[PDB]
Amino acid sequence: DYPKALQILMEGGTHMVCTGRTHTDRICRFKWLCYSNEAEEFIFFHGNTSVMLPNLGSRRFQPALLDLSTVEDHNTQYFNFVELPAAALRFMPKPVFVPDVALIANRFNPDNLMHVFHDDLLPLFYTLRQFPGLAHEARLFFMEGWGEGAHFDLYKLLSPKQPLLRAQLKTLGRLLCFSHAFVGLSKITTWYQYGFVQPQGPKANILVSGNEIRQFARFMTEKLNVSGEEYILVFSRTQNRLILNEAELLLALAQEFQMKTVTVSLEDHTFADVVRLVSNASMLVSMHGAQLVTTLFLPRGATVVELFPYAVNPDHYTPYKTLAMLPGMDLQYVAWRNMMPENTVTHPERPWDQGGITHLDRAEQARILQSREVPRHLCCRNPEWLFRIYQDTKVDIPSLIQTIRRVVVGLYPGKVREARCQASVHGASEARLTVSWQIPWNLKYLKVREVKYEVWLQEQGENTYVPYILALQNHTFTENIKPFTTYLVWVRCIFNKILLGPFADVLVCNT
Amino acid sequence: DYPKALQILMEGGTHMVCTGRTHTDRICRFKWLCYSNEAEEFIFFHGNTSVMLPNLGSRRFQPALLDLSTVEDHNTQYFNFVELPAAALRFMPKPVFVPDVALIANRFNPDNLMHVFHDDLLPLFYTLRQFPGLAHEARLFFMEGWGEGAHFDLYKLLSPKQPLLRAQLKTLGRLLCFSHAFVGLSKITTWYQYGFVQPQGPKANILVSGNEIRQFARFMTEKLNVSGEEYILVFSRTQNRLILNEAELLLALAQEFQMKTVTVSLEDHTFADVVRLVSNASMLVSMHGAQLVTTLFLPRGATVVELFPYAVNPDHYTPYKTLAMLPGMDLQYVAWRNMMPENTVTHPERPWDQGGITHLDRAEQARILQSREVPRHLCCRNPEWLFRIYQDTKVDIPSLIQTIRRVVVGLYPGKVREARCQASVHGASEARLTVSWQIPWNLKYLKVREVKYEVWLQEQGENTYVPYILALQNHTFTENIKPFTTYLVWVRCIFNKILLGPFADVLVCNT
Ligand SMILES: O=c1ccn([C@@H]2O[C@H](COP(=O)(O)OP(=O)(O)O)[C@@H](O)[C@H]2O)c(=O)[nH]1
Ligand SMILES: O=c1ccn([C@@H]2O[C@H](COP(=O)(O)OP(=O)(O)O)[C@@H](O)[C@H]2O)c(=O)[nH]1
Numbered sequence A, B: 001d002y003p004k005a006l007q008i009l010m011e012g013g014t015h016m017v018c019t020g021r022t023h024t025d026r027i028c029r030f031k032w033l034c035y036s037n038e039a040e041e042f043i044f045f046h047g048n049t050s051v052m053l054p055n056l057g058s059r060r061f062q063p064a065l066l067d068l069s070t071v072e073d074h075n076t077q078y079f080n081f082v083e084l085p086a087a088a089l090r091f092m093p094k095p096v097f098v099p100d101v102a103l104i105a106n107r108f109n110p111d112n113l114m115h116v117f118h119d120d121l122l123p124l125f126y127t128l129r130q131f132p133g134l135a136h137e138a139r140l141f142f143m144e145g146w147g148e149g150a151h152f153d154l155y156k157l158l159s160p161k162q163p164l165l166r167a168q169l170k171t172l173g174r175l176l177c178f179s180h181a182f183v184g185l186s187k188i189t190t191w192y193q194y195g196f197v198q199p200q201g202p203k204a205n206i207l208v209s210g211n212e213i214r215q216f217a218r219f220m221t222e223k224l225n226v227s228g229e230e231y232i233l234v235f236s237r238t239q240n241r242l243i244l245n246e247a248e249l250l251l252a253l254a255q256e257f258q259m260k261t262v263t264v265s266l267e268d269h270t271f272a273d274v275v276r277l278v279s280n281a282s283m284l285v286s287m288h289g290a291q292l293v294t295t296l297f298l299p300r301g302a303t304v305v306e307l308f309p310y311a312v313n314p315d316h317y318t319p320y321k322t323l324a325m326l327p328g329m330d331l332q333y334v335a336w337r338n339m340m341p342e343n344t345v346t347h348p349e350r351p352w353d354q355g356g357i358t359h360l361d362r363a364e365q366a367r368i369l370q371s372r373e374v375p376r377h378l379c380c381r382n383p384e385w386l387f388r389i390y391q392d393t394k395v396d397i398p399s400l401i402q403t404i405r406r407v408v409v410g411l412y413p414g415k416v417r418e419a420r421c422q423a424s425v426h427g428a429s430e431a432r433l434t435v436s437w438q439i440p441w442n443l444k445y446l447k448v449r450e451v452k453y454e455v456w457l458q459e460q461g462e463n464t465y466v467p468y469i470l471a472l473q474n475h476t477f478t479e480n481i482k483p484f485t486t487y488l489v490w491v492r493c494i495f496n497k498i499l500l501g502p503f504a505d506v507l508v509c510n511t
């Protein structure tokens, strides 16, 4: 309803309510957020019912309101708006309204399958499902400035409505206003950082586990219409980073591990067929590369074998190691390296970004050629890294087989209950303290190999009294227990040495 | 549909997706979260589609998953669940399902009007509106263990469905399971902390402003059905903390400020009539106390006059000062203190919690009686604080009038645009650097008293080169500009000295 819509906007203005503490995981819900196609700016209109929560003042630019993309590149990462009085619409073209609920987001690299899944698809899947209804109603708006890219078919599976690119918005009018828009992508599913500040590596406190990956994987499998069976799957590339003796590799793996081997590639199968093959594979063998993000479709119990060309240290490039080894993935991971320069083929004459080093270096071409290992570096330009990563590789088959052969629950306790303490007296003036409790309520439903309890004693005033680990639900303390004194006592239960349960309410004990 | 519901739960288990980084502002969306009325515990069932995002491991108990209440009391603050295998339902009573979408939350003190509005109503209003549909569909479940309390009529205005208390859940069955539940209250509207760790005071970085308070205020006014006119409103108490010369106070204020004065109290008017009176008042006069949270209903331009009894320092008790002075509230705030012991009446013989000090103190009753000012203290027991705060007060009218008489926008710039730099040469070998830019896009729509620009220069390598504040959009740097050198240049625009806009993309300049 155009007149009512324009009136609500011109008089009331924009409304914004956001989750989160800082820009790193603020997600915002907007009503009447506008966008100028000429200025390429989002606009917050101040009207007489406008709401801006949080109201950050100058901190809104330190560095930005929120993160549009999960990749912390300090560039396409950031979202902000500019402020105008709602009354300024009197001097502006009449706006075009977007009635769909929108999710606005930026893609870091839509042409790379790892970036697509890890930076965009998994975050979109769970960001959408944070908010009721978005998953079945939202239209994605990708604002970063890229076109469709090689995997647009995959982005389409995430929104029910056809996504729109920034270029297509210029055709809709000079001033667009969103009646209902969400802005921001959660980083909660991320596990890797690409090396902008320190060398690339896993993130420090990963909050995603196998069950969360698998729920996403099942969703993609159904949207791809692909929901005896022991085989090894070799995920080849056809353009660069080749396995030069692939046919001999396939035969040796089949004979050694005694099961059929099959090849797959992105270039010669539909993605649905890729997912179909990965999803029932017992082993996935592949050169390091973006196709290994399909590891997230493997069945429980499978093995990932990642091959690295000459001079490339597997411990420096662990996005698929990190994924394969997440808690609950139930995969095994094997890295194998080519250490034999006779088994590598370099390509020093290719375009600089496909590995070439003739592009322009003096005696630097000679440092690279003679370096036995690519040193730690930062994103994203390093010449030596691209030179070595785009080598082709002849796999030393006995070394690979021996390497593979060498390299082959979790519920936490509740609080203990009804904890109590009793002081007692013995000898002449000697004090004792007995502490007892009942097992956690959930323990009767579990089958746990080792159950222990940890008791912390503190004389009211100073530090703690060395925790005591016990198997029983009662213990009498004698040493360092003095009469006429108050002790605070805490108890927690521990499953299998490492699953630390919560502490109960502190007990105050008087001797 | 009971069999389908039970099957989805027993096979798939619980799903959880949460916003936020830490327990302080994590809000969680659950499907199939259950609750045992006997154990008084929430239950996460692990099934073969269970999702727990974030998966915190042991950090889920450091200290808790999320905060059920906005008051950081380390007690009713915390929410957690205990984990069970979904298969354990074979050995459990059949669950009762809750079909309504639920918002689960804890109230810190439902009997105190300040705690009700600041801890519960405002956070509920915006937490509900973070998520589409909750505002018109959710049923509140208050789990803290209190009954209805004196302001239950107000909590009812926030959910469209009748809220439920924990006591009423025990009557519904042994095991309840929520098909759709949100858990957590945002702290984003809070402005005060009640002194559990350091003495009570405003919070350090308040993110709520007048427009956000007012949107909430308008909503309450409509749900209360209450949406010439210059008058002063005296908000009296009838039970304790009395103004002993109220009638003389009313007459003196009316004659001095030349407008009608009116009284109001919680005890003798309906809350809707209270809101009706506060909402058009030009001045609100009241003893310090919970009734002053109605400050948030005042019209723009009004004045709050808060009276403090003998020995109570206004600077130590600022919840209504802080509220009145929030950016965008457009209120004035006056605190007045009784410094005259002849004008105070103490009540040393009342119950300890209504001010009494005979309850039990030796020569401590004498320290309190002779102390000229209540010292800084922590929540919530302090004897001297309760003794002084429950005094009655005769107001010294000339002192109050003189005190009142003595004590009587904000849009930020966009980025500058098209910033460029040119190196130039002068004398023999002397280098100059000229920098220019266009004004921010939003500036043409504003009326700003002072517009300046701040330019930061850095010789690539060391720190910055003292920012230069300029009024023009171009400037030539001469001193400390060396040839054969690279300078990074940043520019931001500043409105009225304190509204700092964002920096544009850095300029790289070569001399
Ligand atoms: O022979 C090739 C080389 C690349 N790619 C795909 O093209 C994209 C870009 O490859 P690039 O080498 O840049 O990334 P990488 O594999 O190093 O992550 C990725 O999605 C690869 O899976 C492919 O399908 N075949
Ligand atoms: O004479 C009185 C005293 C208190 N109250 C209300 O009773 C509650 C508890 O008052 P208390 O003194 O405990 O809190 P305070 O006013 O100090 O915040 C608050 O909502 C007060 O507004 C009231 O209506 N009349």
Ligand SMILES: *[C@@H]1O[C@H](CO)[C@@H](O)[C@H](O)[C@H]1NC(C)=O
Residues within 6 Å of the ligand: A011, A012, A048, A049
């Ligand atoms: C804003 O203006 C419109 C009409 O101009 C009016 O309906 C609405 O109540 C106004 N709100 C305020 C807070 O002034």
Ligand SMILES: *[C@@H]1O[C@H](CO)[C@@H](O)[C@H](O)[C@H]1NC(C)=O
Residues within 6 Å of the ligand: B011, B012, B048, B049
């Ligand atoms: C879980 O079990 C049910 C039936 O027992 C089945 O429909 C569903 O596909 C199972 N999911 C997995 C991941 O095993």
